[PDB]
Structure 1
Amino acid sequence: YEIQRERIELGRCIGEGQFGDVHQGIYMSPENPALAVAIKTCKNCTSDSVREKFLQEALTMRQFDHPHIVKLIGVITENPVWIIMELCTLGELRSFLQVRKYSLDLASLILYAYQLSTALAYLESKRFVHRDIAARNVLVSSNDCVKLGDFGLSRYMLPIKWMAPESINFRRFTSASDVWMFGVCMWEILMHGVKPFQGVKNNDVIGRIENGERLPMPPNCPPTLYSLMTKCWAYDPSRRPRFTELKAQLSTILEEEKAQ
């Protein structure tokens, strides 16, 4: 898991994290072809507390092995401390959707929702609660492949417009509150990267949700898919489906779209 710094060709900065800049780059793997990687850097990792907190983000990702969750490639524990992650070449999902808009067929938008449900069903199997499921934290590996981005790099692991009522009211975060967030993420995909409750103040969102109001059916969204979103948005968390159920229904919805 230790990587030697001379085996890294550092490229363009692709974002800013809590500990430092994130770069795109190449990892010259021994006896293998070079890999496209994402480099999480750390500015203040000279302090033992900062370094321990930063390296804990790599340990979090190390425990996951799923094709739709970014992989930890390795770490560089010499100063400056770097975390080497798998690169998703095409970048952030919200930007990809805004550029490609209706040129992305429905079969592709449903495929993205399905792929995310397989990663979230995998996290659920390992009893891990994400807390920040949103299109902002999804990345694009290729035209037919999306992935959950780095967990440390995710800002809220307050996004009130994505949160379940029990998370807003009592700060309760469970796999059921992740399902509510995933429903909002599915809505964002079908809306081509448009943010939920745009132009609505965060305090009024809570009132609307309690009153039974939900995000509208996106244009050209299959009714079976909008029905699946409304099940994620059941006020009572015990009435919301689990990720394995969402995965099965999304698979059926994807097959039906491919048929026509």
Structure 2
Amino acid sequence: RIIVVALYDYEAIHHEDLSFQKGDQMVVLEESGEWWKARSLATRKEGYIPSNYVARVDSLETEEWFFKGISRKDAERQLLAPGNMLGSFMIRDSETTKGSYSLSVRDYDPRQGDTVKHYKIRTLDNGGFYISPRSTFSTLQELVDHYKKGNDGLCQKLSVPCMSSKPQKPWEKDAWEIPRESLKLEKKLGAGQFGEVWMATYNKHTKVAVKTMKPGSMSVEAFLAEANVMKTLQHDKLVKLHAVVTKEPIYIITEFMAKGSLLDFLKSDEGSKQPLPKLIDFSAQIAEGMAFIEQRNYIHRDLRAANILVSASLVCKIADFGLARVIFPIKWTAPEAINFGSFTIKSDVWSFGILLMEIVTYGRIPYPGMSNPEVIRALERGYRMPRPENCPEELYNIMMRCWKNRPEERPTFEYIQSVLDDFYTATESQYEEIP
């Protein structure tokens, strides 16, 4: 008999799913992935619930200050999000110490401004917890209550848990292939050589985006094959594919990203007011997404700001991954792909360097003034785009390493991400040590 408690309010929108409130307890009848079958102890009703909206009773996940599956960098990002203040904190799973926990706290100093500090929490293998060996607690809540009184070694006194946000509702169960009649394409966002993109509604309850592909250009059994791989590439920094209409013309259904492309966002007014450290964070998010693709031994083939999407909370997500395979733009392309058609993960690295320049120049076109054949004649000679007035030397150095004539001499995305993530933090300063 497994009992869970709702972490957030939820309103049913399907046939057999349950509505519930935060605090509602339920009995698990079936664990079947993103959707669980359960009985509400409040309503006595049986039905389906989103598994990531619930957690077992009195487990850490029920605590308002606990954040599961959160990396140090994500914690930093979430803590520096609007709605938070000094002392805003979170207890989270340790990234570099499996099985253990870490404390992240919002801090401030006149030199650096608003910052986030991180403290290792040590388990006593018997066993309570401590950050300082001279101060030990039975539970994490006790630790939290202690440091709420005063910093006692910490950079700041603990105040209020990090502001959280509802997770996205999971897509309808067993609805990868949908009938076209389930969609209403309401507003056309853009149109191009290979098709259009629309803002749409699925079954009158879910806002989505739909990419409509012109029959051509390309094969429908080459797409359907690739589409079953693209669905397995799930990551926070890759746009989520929800569904596909298999009858030509092909429709591709994904999550709606409220702020459109990165390219358009950088040229906008809200984008023009983003400081350099924010632009670097954008790059780091994209590198994280590309490190995932690299790790899954996949390729993108069309990396540029136009194919990066931006959410309302300024999360960058990679789009059109693995679409060029089953189907402008030589300024983003590696020499070995322009000349020999050799597309690898290393050619994407070349593309990333160019994208980096787009970001730092707020959407300026690569090689301004030059032309497509005119650029190719510059790569042979060994010409590279000069450093802009707002680009740091070390940032420009990353571009140069991406722009090596020899693909083998180009760094991995795993490395690029690690550099960009900690661009402003010395390695020795990642965690804070307290006696």
User: So what's the TM-score if we normalise by structure 2?
Assistant: 0.52
What is the CA distance between 1:7 and its match in structure 2? 4.5
Paired position in structure 1 for 2:209: 38
Deviation at 1:168, TM superposition (A): 1.9
Report whether the alignment pairs 1:16 with 2:191: yes
- Determine if contact 1:139/1:146 at 8 Å carries over to the other structure: yes
Q: Is the helix fraction higher in 1 or 2? A: 1
Query: Secondary structure in 2 aligned to 1:170?
Result: coil
CA distance in 2, matches of 1:199, 1:19: 27
Greater mean alpha carbon deviation, residues 139-148 or residues 232-241 = 139-148
Aligned pair in 2 of structure 1 residues 110, 35: CA closer, same or farther (>3 Å)? farther
1:175 partnered with 2:345: yes
Aligned equivalent of 1:140: 310
Rg (Cα) greater in structure? 2
* Range with bigger deviation, 19-28 or 94-103: 19-28
Structure 1, residues 50-98: CA drift from partner, whole Å, max 9, x if none?
5435544533421210111111111234676532111111101111100
Structure 1 equivalent of residue 388 of structure 2: 218
Deviation at 1:202, TM superposition (A): 1.9
CA drift of 1:124 comes to 0.8
Q: Which residue of 1 aligns with 2:160?
A: none
User: Residues 2 and 164 (structure 1 numbering): CA distance in 2 closer, same or farther, change over 3 Å?
Assistant: closer
Q: Is the partner of 1:22 in helix, strand or coil?
A: strand
Which of 77, 86, 97 lines up with 2:255 in the alignment?
Answer: 86
Q: Which residue of the partner structure matches residue 72 of structure 1? A: 241
Checking the alignment, whether the CA contact within 8 Å between 1:17 and 1:40 is kept in structure 2 is no
Partner of 1:240: 410
The alpha carbon displacement at 1:151 in A equals 3.2
**What is the Cα deviation at residue 42 of structure 1?**
4.8
1:137–1:154 Cα contact (<8 Å) kept = no
CA distance in 2, matches of 1:94, 1:36: 23
Task: Name the CA distance, whole Å, in 1 between partners of 2:380 and 2:392.
Answer: 26
The CA deviation at 1:6 is 5.3
Q: Which moved more, 1:159-168 or 1:243-252?
A: 159-168
Gaps of 5+ in 2: 1-175, 427-435
SS in 1 for 2:330: coil
Residue 27 of structure 1 corresponds to 202
Distance 1:197 1:156, change over 3 A: farther
Question: Is 1:123 matched with 2:293?
Answer: yes
> What code does the residue aligned with 1:21 have?
E
Q: 1:212 to 1:5 in 2, by over 3 A?
A: closer
CA spacing shift, 1:59–1:18, aligned 2, 3 Å: farther
Determine the C-alpha separation between the residues in 1 that align with 2:395 and 2:243. Answer: 38
The answer to whether the aligner puts 1:3 opposite 2:178 as a matched pair is yes
Query: Following the alignment from structure 1 to structure 2, what is the Cα–Cα distance between the partners of residues 212 and 43?
Result: 39
SS in 1 for 2:339: helix
Q: Distance in 2 between matches of 1:36 and 1:60?
A: 24
Could you tell me which amino acid in structure 1 is paired with residue 365 of structure 2? Answer: K
**Residues of 2 paired with 1:154 and 1:192: CA distance?**
25
Unaligned 5+ residue runs, structure 1? none
Distance 1:149 1:89, change over 3 A: same
Distance 1:158 1:21, change over 3 A: closer
1:20 Cα deviation from its structure 2 partner: 3.9
The verdict on how the C-alpha distance between 1:110 and 1:81 changes in structure 2, with shifts beyond 3 A counting, is same
Which residue is 2:44 aligned to?
A: none
Match of 1:202 in 2: 372
CA drift of 1:21 comes to 2.8
Q: 1:82 to 1:171 in 2, by over 3 A?
A: closer
Structure 1 stretches of at least 4 aligned residues deviating more than 6 Å after TM superposition: none
Give the 3 Å change call, closer, same or farther, for CA 19–231 of structure 1 in structure 2. closer
Higher mean Cα deviation, 180-189 or 152-161? 152-161
| Counterpart Cα distance in 2 of 1:157 and 1:222 | 37
| Aligned residue identity for 2:210 | I
Letter in 2 for 1:214: R
CA distance in 2, matches of 1:140, 1:35: 19
**Structure (1/2) with the larger strand percentage:** 2
Identical positions, percent: 41
Determine the structure 2 residue equivalent to 1:227.
Answer: 397
SS in 2 for 1:161: helix
Instruction: Say whether the 8 Å CA contact 2:215–2:248 is kept in structure 1.
Output: no
Structure 2: distance between partners of 1:94 and 1:8: 28
> Superposition RMSD on alpha carbons, in Å?
2.7
Q: Normalising to structure 1: TM-score of the pair? A: 0.84
